[PDB]
Amino acid sequence: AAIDPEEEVIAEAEGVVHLHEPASILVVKARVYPFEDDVEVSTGDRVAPGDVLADGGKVKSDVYGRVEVDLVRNVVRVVESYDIDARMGAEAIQQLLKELDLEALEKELLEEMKHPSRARRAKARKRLEVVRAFLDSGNRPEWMILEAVPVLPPDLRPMVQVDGGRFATSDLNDLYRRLINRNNRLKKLLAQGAPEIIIRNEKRMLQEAVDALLDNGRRGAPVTNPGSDRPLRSLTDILSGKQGRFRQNLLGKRVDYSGRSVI
Amino acid sequence: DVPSKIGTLLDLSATELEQVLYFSKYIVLDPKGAILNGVPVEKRQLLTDEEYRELRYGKQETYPLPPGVDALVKDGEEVVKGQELAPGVVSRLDGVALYRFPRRVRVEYVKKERAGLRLPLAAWVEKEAYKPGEILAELPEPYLFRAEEEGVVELKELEEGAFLVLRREDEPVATYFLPVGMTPLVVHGEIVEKGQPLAEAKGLLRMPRQ
Amino acid sequence: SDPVRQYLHEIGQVPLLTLEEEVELARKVEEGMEAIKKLSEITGLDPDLIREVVRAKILGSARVRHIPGLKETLDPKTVEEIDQKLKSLPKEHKRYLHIAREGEAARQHLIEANLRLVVSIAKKYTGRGLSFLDLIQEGNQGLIRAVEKFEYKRRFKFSTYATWWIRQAINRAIADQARTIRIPVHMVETINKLSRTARQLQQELGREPTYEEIAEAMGPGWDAKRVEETLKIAQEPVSLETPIGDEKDSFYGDFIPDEHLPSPVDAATQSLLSEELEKALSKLSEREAMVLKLRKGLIDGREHTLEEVGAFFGVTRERIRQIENKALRKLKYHESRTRKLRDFLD
DNA sequence: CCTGCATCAGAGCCCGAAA
DNA sequence: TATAATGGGCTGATGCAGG
RNA sequence: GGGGGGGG
């Protein structure tokens, strides 16, 4: 078939067809399973050896794999490949920590505490200090990754009109905006079924948005305002240091009813 | 914050925790019986991108053939390690080789015609049917096969052997078959009268390959 | 360890198409959408919902979620039910299921195969307020919709059509996210014009134009006051954390008083006012001061005009307005003695 | 086992500080 | 919505892969 | 990936 009715090749009369001169040859490791009648599994499905493919159950699959229905070659390919669940990101880790019975872990690490070489003694202790820390506290390890990220009250991240009618704004607002864009656009790339290389890229950028909000500069390049080399000041920055919350406004403040002069 | 609290809870190294959080490696939650490089995939193993694709999507490879060069292999043919596929192409994978875009379609049309032929009898081989390459006759000396109608000749040459068709007006008077060892002495579009030699039959006469 | 470099590596994993592979993939995508349209009518279902159900199984169950606009919540229950009706069709009908699913399989590979195109468009749009990766993803988003509307039979190469949608999606992204005070996309288009206009002006005048020279260079409708109010809108906010020069120990935000919360004097002045405000109503009588107090409201502001007063004060309707005055003027003599309220006049 | 060896978080106060 | 365009510009304390 | 003109 082709563009316009012209240039199509129709078969002049009865005959048999041979294919020659390919663009190129693709060798896949798969199994071919021809069919005469209707096919019962559509393309994309994954299947295990012995599963019913076509023709009411006579043809079946030898291998684990995923299905490729050739309607030209009227044969059901199955490319050998597994229903493997392997994940990337915080989504993976959140599961693995959801999936930890800590009392069991404690029991297992205690058993390792009765062991020489002291090194195994030593690291089974450090692990068991975190285990016990969660057990006594009531914290679930899954809480070290966020589903909901909190938003700070606006009067603590103000945007105010200063003398000039100009506006002045706290850095957290730009660190939140970067987060919101990325979350929002990820939401849309999901609904539009984008390839996983694209979804992967945004998912990682989402992490880095969360990581600059919470503790900009901690890992990787510090996010800066456009046309400035100034790291944006993130929540960690606020808390910490000589100019941080503690040392600048909690252990010492400016005061009323005071004054200064030469002596 | 060192040592990572997530890292220690999980017995994941610094590097391992980065790779899965920053989308540089996978970490498996249920291998569903996978196996890679001879060893079954164990839970909590970390696969690179290539590893993940070989286990989740299967292995494959496509090889260019030079323009105009035809393949030493056919569509749907199972291939071994290092089997050769095009004059300069050698596959590095076992599996089912699949044609991509054939530039040349050859459709062999089926034709069933009845055609005639006259030979000596001391020279003919008697049997009820002849199938390709089978010997048809052996002539002690050369015999000249003569036209048995008057007409214009429409010559149709096949790879080996020939067809001859005379006709007056546009109605075919005669359909003759010239096997191998029989070289036509007429050309297409020639007019011939009754009994002009159409072809020389020399020695062994056989039915052609096709 | 570097996020640009890693994505550049991951798109180098997909080989780029040849003209036949490109047209093959494009081919199957469009035929696949025609598949799903006809499957809407056979089925009595909705093309979008069929589109997402076909979509679900090609990608794997990794991705399954509710898609905005679809009538059913898209969970493994409904996609199993909807898939098995799809597979419950005659072989001449269900051949179109197979077409859909390789539709979406080609679309994926067509997208992945053109990711390098987005990079080389996005790299030219650096330094306009969006980060490189933020550009790419917005560019990729255009590529996605260039795949869904490409008509392969016009025989243009895919690069040619996709470039239009990519640049379209990048430049929206810039104009919609780059400003802390987001402003409408066409209004930024006007602002950008003032600057190009001025830059050429300055480029010929050998000095900075005034608003009037811009205004006429902008054509009809533009005067100098409108050049001026356009720029005040274009003004970007500045950071509370800006260092006040010195960079050691000085933030801009530390110089900015809080004018919302009352100061101790103000909060004291407002308390002081209500204190002698009611200690002045009760000193004639509180009843006629209650009528007036009901008129304005110590805490509520109960101020309309004519009507509601028809109800509960104690009297009918025009009398409250009268005792309004007599309370007011008894107040005014009452104040010529207690003249301590003059000071509140500021 | 121990040591190089790497990765991180420290580095005085208050006032003018001329943006 | 359509020529084609396809990979960036100084210290100390502590937890580690390695002689 | 941590830092500066003046006064005490």
Side-chain angles (χ1 to χ4, degrees), chain A, chain B, chain C residues 1-243 245 250-346:
Chain A
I3 44 57
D4 322 298
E6 319 77 325
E7 318 165 346
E8 301 191 50
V9 315
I10 194 97
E12 250 169 71
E14 182 172 321
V16 84
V17 307
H18 300 251
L19 286 307
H20 289 280
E21 207 68 282
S24 296
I25 169 65
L26 158 49
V27 50
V28 316
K29 314 186 78 116
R31 300 306 164 89
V32 286
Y33 303 100
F35 64 88
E36 289 115 290
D37 189 45
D38 180 42
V39 181
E40 301 293 325
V41 312
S42 205
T43 204
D45 306 348
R46 200 163 256 102
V47 278
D51 282 343
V52 47
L53 269 42
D55 296 60
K58 319 206 320 163
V59 86
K60 62 170 73 172
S61 36
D62 299 341
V63 199
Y64 286 111
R66 53 134 48 169
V67 73
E68 214 168 353
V69 168
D70 202 320
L71 261 165
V72 159
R73 309 190 178 82
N74 304 55
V75 52
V76 166
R77 261 169 308 220
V78 153
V79 279
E80 177 180 6
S81 60
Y82 309 89
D83 201 31
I84 180 57
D85 177 330
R87 313 240 215 191
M88 268 176 160
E91 177 187 43
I93 303 299
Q94 177 173 45
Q95 195 56 20
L96 280 189
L97 307 210
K98 271 194 188 175
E99 289 171 4
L100 243 186
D101 182 54
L102 296 164
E103 316 82 307
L105 201 31
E106 192 188 23
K107 290 175 190 300
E108 311 154 44
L109 300 136
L110 290 173
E111 301 306 278
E112 180 134 323
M113 279 289 302
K114 314 174 251 233
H115 190 274
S117 57
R118 217 140 292 197
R120 253 161 146 181
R121 294 262 212 66
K123 313 305 266 172
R125 184 196 72 239
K126 311 200 237 211
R127 278 193 68 181
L128 191 69
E129 272 175 299
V130 194
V131 174
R132 291 214 139 127
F134 276 102
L135 296 166
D136 311 332
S137 53
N139 287 323
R140 279 246 40 90
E142 33 174 308
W143 298 350
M144 298 183 289
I145 38 66
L146 312 144
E147 288 155 21
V149 79
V151 173
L152 186 77
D155 280 354
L156 312 192
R157 31 184 274 256
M159 157 164 287
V160 299
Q161 225 166 347
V162 52
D163 216 20
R166 295 281 309 214
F167 270 92
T169 198
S170 178
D171 273 1
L172 284 187
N173 288 318
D174 271 9
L175 290 171
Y176 275 116
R177 285 192 322 119
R178 278 160 38 91
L179 186 53
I180 305 200
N181 283 320
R182 301 183 165 184
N183 201 49
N184 280 352
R185 142 166 35 106
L186 174 69
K187 276 196 232 196
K188 91 154 284 190
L189 270 90
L190 294 184
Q192 293 192 304
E196 283 270 322
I197 310 91
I198 291 185
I199 295 292
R200 172 174 337 178
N201 197 31
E202 176 108 24
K203 263 164 92 173
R204 142 172 43 169
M205 291 157 63
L206 196 76
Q207 183 79 334
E208 291 202 346
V210 179
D211 279 342
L213 180 128
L214 291 195
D215 193 359
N216 193 22
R218 181 79 208 61
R219 194 218 148 226
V223 317
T224 82
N225 254 342
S228 179
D229 313 344
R230 197 179 53 72
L232 302 201
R233 149 175 276 223
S234 66
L235 299 99
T236 291
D237 286 316
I238 295 185
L239 284 193
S240 324
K242 195 184 313 166
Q243 301 268 147
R245 205 51 85 210
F246 282 115
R247 285 173 76 188
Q248 173 75 45
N249 325 97
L250 274 299
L251 294 183
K253 325 160 142 72
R254 302 191 167 288
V255 278
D256 291 329
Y257 303 117
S258 65
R260 158 151 309 242
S261 186
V262 164
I263 277 193
Chain B
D1 173 65
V2 314
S4 164
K5 308 293 169 183
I6 297 168
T8 49
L9 262 197
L10 293 199
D11 185 18
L12 276 46
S13 91
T15 300
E16 297 165 2
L17 196 42
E18 174 98 9
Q19 292 169 344
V20 64
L21 275 185
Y22 287 154
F23 304 80
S24 180
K25 289 226 218 262
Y26 294 74
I27 209 89
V28 48
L29 286 70
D30 187 16
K32 282 286 186 45
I35 166 155
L36 167 158
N37 296 337
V39 161
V41 159
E42 39 208 339
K43 162 89 92 78
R44 279 144 152 276
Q45 195 183 169
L46 43 79
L47 324 164
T48 70
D49 214 42
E50 312 77 343
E51 294 171 14
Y52 184 67
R53 274 195 301 266
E54 176 171 351
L55 283 69
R56 177 80 176 166
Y57 296 135
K59 194 24 184 180
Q60 69 187 62
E61 262 216 52
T62 87
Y63 310 76
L65 49 75
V69 179
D70 208 12
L72 293 321
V73 187
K74 219 86 193 176
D75 179 87
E77 269 297 292
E78 282 74 336
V79 173
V80 71
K81 290 297 79 156
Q83 179 169 350
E84 196 272 23
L85 303 321
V89 161
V90 202
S91 153
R92 321 217 223 167
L93 186 58
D94 309 78
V96 50
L98 292 201
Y99 272 96
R100 287 317 279 135
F101 304 144
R103 328 210 204 102
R104 160 162 72 97
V105 196
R106 203 185 260 174
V107 67
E108 306 277 354
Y109 292 98
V110 84
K111 295 198 187 290
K112 310 335 295 147
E113 277 265 54
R114 31 198 288 299
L117 171 82
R118 171 154 8 229
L119 303 135
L121 216 171
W124 173 49
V125 315
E126 163 161 27
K127 59 188 108 195
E128 331 95 306
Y130 295 82
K131 269 169 255 169
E134 207 163 3
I135 201 160
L136 191 61
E138 159 138 42
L139 306 102
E141 260 55 74
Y143 171 77
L144 295 68
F145 167 76
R146 290 154 189 286
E148 292 171 32
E149 292 279 3
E150 308 248 10
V152 316
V153 49
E154 147 173 348
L155 179 45
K156 175 183 268 184
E157 306 188 64
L158 59 156
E159 185 187 349
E160 53 167 35
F163 264 52
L164 216 32
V165 167
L166 299 127
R167 51 173 138 206
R168 313 168 274 243
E169 279 65 2
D170 215 74
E171 301 313 287
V173 292
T175 303
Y176 303 174
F177 157 90
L178 308 112
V180 201
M182 207 157 146
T183 88
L185 291 163
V186 289
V187 317
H188 187 296
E190 164 161 39
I191 49 80
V192 58
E193 316 186 81
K194 256 149 195 204
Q196 31 184 166
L198 296 191
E200 167 139 283
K202 257 205 316 179
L204 225 35
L205 204 54
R206 104 169 73 96
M207 275 210 324
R209 285 133 174 70
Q210 169 124 329
Chain C
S1 171
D2 166 3
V4 171
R5 174 165 280 184
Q6 166 99 52
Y7 175 96
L8 299 180
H9 174 87
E10 296 180 356
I11 66 179
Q13 299 324 313
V14 77
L16 39 63
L17 309 188
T18 53
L19 170 56
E20 330 106 327
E21 310 181 303
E22 164 177 325
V23 58
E24 171 178 4
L25 292 185
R27 179 191 322 136
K28 328 199 47 77
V29 173
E30 160 159 325
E31 322 185 339
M33 324 172 49
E34 324 182 54
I36 321 184
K37 63 139 175 34
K38 296 252 140 165
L39 195 145
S40 173
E41 197 27 272
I42 305 173
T43 45
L45 275 66
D46 165 286
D48 311 293
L49 173 44
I50 294 86
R51 155 78 64 171
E52 304 293 349
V53 169
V54 180
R55 261 256 186 73
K57 301 265 179 208
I58 166 59
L59 291 167
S61 190
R63 197 173 326 177
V64 59
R65 63 163 286 175
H66 181 75
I67 278 70
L70 274 50
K71 299 179 306 176
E72 306 260 11
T73 307
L74 293 213
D75 46 71
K77 154 258 159 187
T78 88
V79 309
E80 269 321 295
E81 324 319 343
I82 270 58
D83 176 300
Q84 314 268 9
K85 182 17 55 182
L86 279 181
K87 177 42 210 196
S88 305
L89 294 207
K91 101 178 306 181
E92 70 263 10
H93 277 359
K94 287 201 297 257
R95 81 170 261 100
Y96 298 1
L97 181 66
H98 300 272
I99 304 288
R101 305 217 332 188
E102 194 167 49
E104 278 280 327
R107 156 195 202 259
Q108 308 279 311
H109 192 3
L110 183 51
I111 304 177
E112 321 197 327
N114 285 276
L115 292 182
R116 341 200 176 191
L117 191 69
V118 170
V119 165
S120 59
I121 301 185
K123 67 177 279 185
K124 302 196 242 132
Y125 288 76
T126 74
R128 325 227 315 198
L130 279 203
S131 69
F132 199 17
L133 269 88
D134 278 320
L135 292 171
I136 275 160
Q137 291 297 108
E138 294 287 354
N140 286 0
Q141 224 172 282
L143 168 62
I144 286 187
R145 254 181 251 109
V147 168
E148 307 213 11
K149 293 217 78 205
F150 189 58
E151 284 167 359
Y152 82 106
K153 255 128 53 155
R154 308 178 183 222
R155 296 84 153 309
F156 305 109
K157 249 194 267 181
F158 180 70
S159 61
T160 288
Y161 187 55
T163 295
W164 187 91
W165 285 90
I166 291 157
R167 310 206 278 230
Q168 199 67 40
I170 280 172
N171 294 54
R172 172 172 214 142
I174 300 179
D176 191 39
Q177 324 191 322
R179 292 173 153 266
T180 296
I181 53 61
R182 180 236 157 216
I183 52 77
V185 156
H186 62 86
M187 168 72 35
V188 61
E189 212 170 42
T190 280
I191 292 161
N192 296 255
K193 195 170 45 151
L194 270 82
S195 322
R196 329 188 284 246
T197 315
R199 293 170 27 237
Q200 176 210 322
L201 281 170
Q202 143 183 309
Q203 214 199 81
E204 37 174 276
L205 300 122
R207 65 142 165 87
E208 194 71 30
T210 175
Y211 308 156
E212 284 84 5
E213 294 142 309
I214 303 145
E216 298 249 45
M218 300 274 299
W222 285 83
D223 62 344
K225 171 64 90 98
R226 161 205 185 85
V227 175
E228 174 177 4
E229 189 32 76
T230 291
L231 298 183
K232 208 216 319 171
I233 290 164
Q235 264 183 5
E236 294 211 64
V238 66
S239 168
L240 279 181
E241 289 74 25
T242 303
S250 71
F251 291 155
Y252 189 101
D254 290 331
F255 298 85
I256 296 173
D258 177 280
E259 327 212 36
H260 187 67
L261 267 151
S263 63
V265 280
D266 295 331
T269 284
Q270 222 270 2
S271 272
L272 198 173
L273 172 64
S274 307
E275 297 225 333
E276 304 326 272
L277 262 189
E278 285 340 282
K279 270 196 203 302
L281 268 51
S282 309
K283 294 324 189 270
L284 315 176
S285 75
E286 204 43 2
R287 163 63 291 194
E288 188 23 41
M290 187 82 173
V291 162
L292 181 59
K293 201 177 173 179
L294 286 164
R295 170 56 213 92
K296 307 303 186 70
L298 163 50
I299 289 181
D300 108 293
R302 199 173 165 86
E303 309 193 61
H304 294 50
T305 321
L306 300 106
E307 306 67 23
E308 306 172 12
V309 193
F312 169 76
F313 273 76
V315 316
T316 296
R317 88 164 299 282
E318 279 306 329
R319 181 98 214 279
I320 293 306
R321 206 224 35 64
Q322 248 172 2
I323 57 192
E324 142 171 49
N325 288 317
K326 81 139 167 160
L328 269 40
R329 50 162 61 91
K330 252 187 204 257
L331 254 186
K332 165 143 253 292
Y333 178 80
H334 150 286
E335 221 284 335
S336 266
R337 184 191 97 272
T338 318
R339 44 143 310 282
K340 248 166 187 196
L341 284 57
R342 191 265 174 279
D343 306 304
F344 300 70
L345 268 173
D346 278 326

